[PDB]
């Protein structure tokens, strides 16, 4: 599944259910942080990326120094898809 | 306030109160993401860094492509202090 494909599936699902539709993005090279894409309905669908631990998935992530490389890789993912994303979808304000 | 100084103040406060003691870390160059250091008591004090939005401070942050640079700067902060931190404190597992 390409990013676009996941976007499209999560938008569809969120629209049909009128609730948050989420999916883990399998970004290469990330060791510990789990990245999840969410489609959030309002009126309208808005997207966000949330980060998560493995150990306490539903809780808020507690970052440690060992997450530095993961964080850079998330940053790089965002830049690589930035132009596409900003044309293709709208994010939570 | 140096990092060590904030660490020491948050450890002291968390120990005296038996509850989470938090403080925003004023890391230079970060535009939007708010970084907060937390001291969490168990038995023992464990530290975490959490990230936050300005707009929905208490909610979970929804990352967007515009946060890429902030994320890199957090990564760089973590690497710059990594050796000190891993000697000086213990993190949430």
Swiss-Prot record, chains A, B:
Protein name, UniProt field: Uncharacterized protein 131
Organism whose genome encodes this protein: Sulfolobus islandicus rod-shaped virus 1 (SIRV-1)
């Amino acid at each position: 599944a390409s990013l676009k494909e996941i976007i499209d599936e999560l938008g569809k699902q969120a629209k049909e259910q009128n609730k948050i539709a989420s999916r883990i993005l399998k970004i290469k090279g990330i060791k510990r942080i789990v990245v999840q894409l969410n489609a959030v309905p309002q009126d309208k669908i808005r997207y966000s990326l949330t980060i998560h631990s493995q150990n306490n998935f539903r809780k808020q992530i507690g970052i440690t120094p060992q997450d530095a490389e993961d964080l850079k890789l998330i940053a790089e993912f965002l830049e690589k898809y930035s132009d596409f994303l900003n044309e293709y979808v709208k994010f939570t304000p």
